[PDB]
Every structure is written in structure tokens, then in C-alpha cells.
């Protein structure tokens, strides 16, 4: 029932870009594009570091044939290394013949992408995730997963947006972008890093309400209305992100005849309790799907 | 006992191995008289290294950017030409250790030795068989291109191979010394599916004669199969055609066991070995040519 799932972008263009990078007694995953391979910099730790690594000093002990980088059974030769933020960019002797059209970008909280979980250079599965206000994601990562990559498709072109590094707490995950820069305020050290406070992603909930309405589940729609300005004042205090403008919500507004401000009010009422009733079978707000996720699965796109 | 993959000695070939660099790429060349041969792709960077424009890379080429090391020596390139997929660069210094040599071309089932080198510096050598697919099963890392395959025929070296390419299947290929690729391959990082491979029949027969010679003839029975009927069959079952072969004739002489007897054994054995082994093996072995088994068992 419902028509909407956590859909991942297909993985065939990313998988042949995943490699293993090994340094000392430590292996993790890397992303190989043109003649670059990206991986986390803690690859150059040996585990009586992890806690508070002095990475610049670690760098000094790095020499060139210290890196083994495997694509399947093929060993790549590294021609240069540099540290950039919390990632190494390792230039190699070889151009990856499978390199796709790509870009590097960033995900704002509420935006979703796919993660390709890999171990030892070998991909294992993919899953949908939402960047939270905490600048964390809810993934599924064991030991050896670092260097797994999160991405967005665009038909033919891949936008790479995440490199896994860090677990803050049970089931709570963060990492870097491809400038090697951590999302939110975190960093690569095994110390207490308490996550930024996390908000309900308001626009995603709105998209989810519009899906519910399209699916003929509209009991929460009432005659009242609350404006964006009014909502945004109230959001701060109550654990919700600022509603911004959004053309997809607008398109859904038009399709359903239910207005954004109609659902803002509804959200306010729904905060004080679902009182037994379910929305597409949950008693909590669902905020894990972006507007355009909802619109693409129901209206296509 | 015994039989082994016997590699030819490398002493005549080693002093010929040079490094070639241009811009970014360092790979390997072969220096004979005042010519050094090498893959033409030496003039690409990663930037164009996927589909490279060859005729156009040529134009920007200024001599002085070439760098050819023989040990710590450094040859001066006079001129250069592109011949198919190799560069042939002329140097001023004639190579003092040029063996007597020719250039040739191996056919499926024919074997030869490869001298793997890196950065002009030989590292190991191994024995291979050219497959139906015009590929070989080598051991090659980045930097190995321009490592050479060759055979020793008498007082002479027949140069036969120049490595360039690892296919998607894990097997390898390259050019003969007229700069032409074996089979349909090409110097571009694009999808190239190798064609199907045939078991190389005269080679199997040869390994079977090796087995007999090493007191393991359990598979020899009293059925016989003509080369005419085998061929008809071979086609349909993944075996290459049998052709007249003087070394097998000589092996049939040594052992008493006719070729036809072995074609029969092959048709039977094709149904599996039943975990009986032949020369500690459970599959057909086709990597040794007649002349290999012969050289080793008779001299």
C-alpha cells in the first residue's frame, strides 16, 4: 500500500570506482576517479593513535610505496600523496577506464542520497539516507566501512557528496565531503563528540503529508492554516527546521488542492499527538524522504 | 624425468631493455642496433589516456622531451616514427649488445618467453602460450608495457611480442614488432571482449606424449580417431583443429603411440577424468607446445 519507498540510485557506475587502500596493517575503502583515489586520512594511523592523532607527524613517516591500492586484483601505483582536510588524495599511474561523468558537491540537511557500503574495496549494498540537522546520517556501517561513498544520480552524471569516516554513537554516522571537509563540526578523532541538536526536517514531513493525501489519507487536514513566517517562529522552539520555499511542494500543493499553510497548521496539531490515528501506518512524523523523492516516485520524474 | 614451464634464458635480452619517458609516462623499450621500440601510448598522459588522439599527440612531440635510459646511461634520440601502435625511435648510439635477431609473429598455441620489466629494469620472466583469442595469461602490473616476448631459435632471438593491454577478463595482449596488435585489439581503454578460446589440441597431444614418457599412460586404449574425424568433432566441442606436426610425429616415434590413439583419448577424456589425475592435473593442459615437451624430454 502506498507507492513510496526508500529508493536508491542504481550502483553500476560507482561500483567499478571502489578500491582498497592499505597502509601498514590497516585497510579501508577509496573512490577512484580519473587518476585520483580519495580515501580517509586515518588510513595512516596505527591504532595506538586513534584517540588523538597528530596527522602532520604521521604524514612525515609516509613514504610512497607504503600504499597498496587494489581494484579487484589489479594493483595501482601511487605517484603522489597529499592530505587535504581529513582525506588523502592519492594520484596514481592509471586512469580508471570506468570513470563516470561526475562532480563533487555538498548535501544540506534534509537532502537525501545513496550510500554504497563497501569493505575491503568490495561493495556490499546500497541504502537511502537523509542528511540530518545534526549533520549526521543514519546508516549501517561496521568496521572496515570507512571510505564508503554517498552519491546522487542525474540520469548519466554522478554527484559525489559523502565519504564515511565516523560513528558518533550507536547507529549515528558522519563523514567528509570531497574537499576532505567534515560535515557539521565533527573531526577524525576518537574522543567525545556530542552531536549538534537534531530537528525534524519540516519540508520532508510536508512531502510525506502530500503523499498521504494523494493516497487518500487526509484526516489531519482541517479548515485552519498557519503561515510560513508564523510557522518559522514556532519551529525554533519546538524541534523543527525552518520551512523554506520549494517548487516541488508547490507542485504537490496544486495537485492536491491542499495548501502548504494548511499542512503547517496540521503539523502544529500533530506535534501535540497523533491520538491513536496513523498516517501511512506510523504514529510519528516521517521526514526521511525529500520533496522530490516523493514527487519522483508518485508523479515521475 | 619431469615437465615444467621452461623459460628461455634472459642474458641476451636483458642488455637490450631500456626505459622510455615522455611527459608523464615511464614504460619500457627494446634497443636493437640504433632503434628503440616501444608502445606509442608513451606519449599520452592520464588526461587523454582513455581514448587518446594518436595522430594528433604526434604533432606536439618535440624530441628533447624523450628520455631513454639504458642503466644510468642516457641515449640521444635522433629521429622517431609511429608504426601502428609502437614508436620506433632512432638513437645516435648503436647498441653494443644487440643479439643476432629477427622479428616474427606467433600463432595460437605457439609458446614463448616474456621478460617483465619495470622502469627499464627486468624483474622476472615467464613462459606463455598465445591463445585462440590472441591473448596470453601473464603477470603484469602498471609500468610493464613494452616488456617483450621472444623465442630462442638457434643462435638467434625471434622477437615476437610487446606487451600493452590487460583485458577485462584478466588476460593480456600486445603487438608484434611491426607495431600491429594480435587479434582485433587496440591501444584504448575501451570495452574489448575477447572472443572464445579454443583448447589447443596439438599441445594437449604433446602433454599426453609427455605423460606417456613419464610413465603415466592409463588413458591410452585401443580406440583410434583420424585427424579428419577429430577435426569435424573439435569444432563443435571447443578444440582447435589438428594440423600435421613434425614434432608430434617425432613424439609418436619415441613412444610408439600414434597421434590417432591420442585423439581417441582426448574424445573420451573430454567427458571428465573421474578424479584420475594426469601429471598431477584434472583438466587438459595446453600451455606446452610440442617443441617444448620435445626439447625437455629428448633434448
Amino acid at each position: 500500500s502506498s507507492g513510496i519507498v526508500k529508493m536508491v540510485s542504481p550502483t553500476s557506475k560507482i561500483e567499478p570506482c571502489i578500491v582498497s587502500v592499505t597502509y601498514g596493517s590497516m585497510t579501508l575503502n577509496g573512490l577512484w576517479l580519473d587518476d585520483k583515489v580519495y580515501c580517509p586520512r586515518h588510513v595512516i594511523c596505527s591504532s595506538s593513535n586513534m584517540n588523538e592523532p597528530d596527522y602532520s607527524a604521521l604524514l612525515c613517516r609516509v613514504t610512497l610505496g607504503d600504499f597498496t591500492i587494489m581494484s579487484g586484483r589489479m594493483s595501482l601505483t601511487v605517484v603522489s600523496y597529499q592530505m587535504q582536510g581529513c582525506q588523502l588524495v592519492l594520484t596514481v599511474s592509471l586512469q580508471n577506464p570506468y570513470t563516470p561523468k561526475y562532480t563533487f558537491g555538498n548535501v544540506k540537511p534534509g537532502e537525501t542520497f545513496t550510500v554504497l557500503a563497501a569493505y575491503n574495496g568490495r561493495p556490499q549494498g546500497a541504502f537511502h539516507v537523509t542528511m540530518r540537522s545534526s549533520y549526521t546520517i543514519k546508516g549501517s556501517f561496521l568496521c572496515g566501512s570507512c571510505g564508503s561513498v554517498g552519491y546522487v544520480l542525474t540520469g548519466d552524471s554522478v554527484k559525489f557528496v559523502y565519504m564515511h569516516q565516523l560513528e558518533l554513537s550507536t547507529g549515528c554516522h558522519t563523514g567528509t565531503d570531497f574537499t576532505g571537509n567534515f560535515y557539521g563540526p565533527y573531526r577524525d578523532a576518537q574522543v567525545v563528540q556530542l552531536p549538534v541538536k537534531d530537528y525534524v526536517q519540516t519540508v520532508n514531513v510536508i512531502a510525506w503529508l502530500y503523499a498521504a493525501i494523494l493516497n487518500n489519507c487526509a484526516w489531519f487536514v482541517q479548515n485552519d492554516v498557519c503561515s510560513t513566517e508564523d510557522f518559522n517562529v514556532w519551529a525554533m522552539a519546538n524541534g523543527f527546521s525552518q520551512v523554506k520555499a520549494d517548487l516541488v511542494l508547490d507542485a504537490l500543493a496544486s495537485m492536491t488542492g491542499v495548501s502548504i499553510e494548511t499542512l503547517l497548521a496540521a503539523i502544529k496539531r500533530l506535534y501535540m499527538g497523533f491520538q491513536g490515528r496513523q498516517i501511512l501506518g506510523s504514529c510519528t512524523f516521517e521526514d526521511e524522504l525529500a520533496p522530490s523523492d516523493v514527487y519522483q516516485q508518485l508523479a515521475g520524474v | 624425468s619431469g615437465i615444467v614451464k621452461m623459460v628461455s634464458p634472459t642474458s641476451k635480452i636483458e642488455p637490450c631493455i631500456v626505459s622510455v619517458t615522455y611527459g608523464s609516462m615511464t614504460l619500457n623499450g627494446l634497443w636493437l642496433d640504433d632503434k628503440v621500440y616501444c608502445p606509442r601510448h608513451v606519449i599520452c598522459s592520464s588526461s587523454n589516456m582513455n581514448e587518446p588522439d594518436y595522430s594528433a599527440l604526434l604533432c606536439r612531440v618535440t624530441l628533447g622531451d624523450f628520455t631513454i635510459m639504458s642503466g644510468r646511461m642516457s641515449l640521444t634520440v635522433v629521429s622517431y616514427q609511429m608504426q601502428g601502435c609502437q614508436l620506433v625511435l632512432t638513437v645516435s648510439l648503436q647498441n653494443p649488445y644487440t643479439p643476432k635477431y629477427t622479428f616474427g609473429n606467433v600463432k595460437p598455441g605457439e609458446t614463448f618467453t616474456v621478460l617483465a620489466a619495470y622502469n627499464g629494469r627486468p624483474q622476472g620472466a615467464f613462459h606463455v602460450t598465445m591463445r585462440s583469442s590472441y591473448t596470453i595469461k601473464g603477470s603484469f602490473l602498471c609500468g610493464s608495457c613494452g616488456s617483450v616476448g621472444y623465442v630462442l631459435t638457434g643462435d638467434s632471438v625471434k622477437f615476437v611480442y610487446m606487451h600493452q593491454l590487460e583485458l577485462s577478463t584478466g588476460c593480456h595482449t600486445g603487438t608484434d614488432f611491426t607495431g600491429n596488435f594480435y587479434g582485433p585489439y587496440r591501444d584504448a581503454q575501451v570495452v574489448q571482449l575477447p572472443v572464445k578460446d579454443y583448447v589447443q589440441t596439438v599441445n594437449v597431444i604433446a602433454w599426453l606424449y609427455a605423460a606417456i614418457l613419464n610413465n603415466c599412460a592409463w588413458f591410452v586404449q585401443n580406440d583410434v580417431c583420424s585427424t579428419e574425424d577429430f577435426n569435424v568433432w573439435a569444432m563443435a566441442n571447443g578444440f582447435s583443429q589438428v594440423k600435421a606436426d613434425l614434432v608430434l610425429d617425432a613424439l609418436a616415434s619415441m613412444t610408439g603411440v600414434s597421434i590417432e590413439t591420442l585423439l581417441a583419448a582426448i574424445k573420451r577424456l573430454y567427458m571428465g577424468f573421474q578424479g584420475r589425475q594426469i601429471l598431477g592435473s584434472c583438466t587438459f593442459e595446453d600451455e606446452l607446445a610440442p617443441s617444448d615437451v620435445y626439447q625437455q624430454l629428448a633434448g
Binding site: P97 | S144, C145, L165, E166, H172, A188, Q189, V190, V191
Partner: peptide, 5 residues
Amino acid sequence: XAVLX
């Protein structure tokens, strides 16, 4: 998809 060495 093939790799030049």
C-alpha cells in the same frame, strides 16, 4: 574497459 599497462 580494458587497461593500458
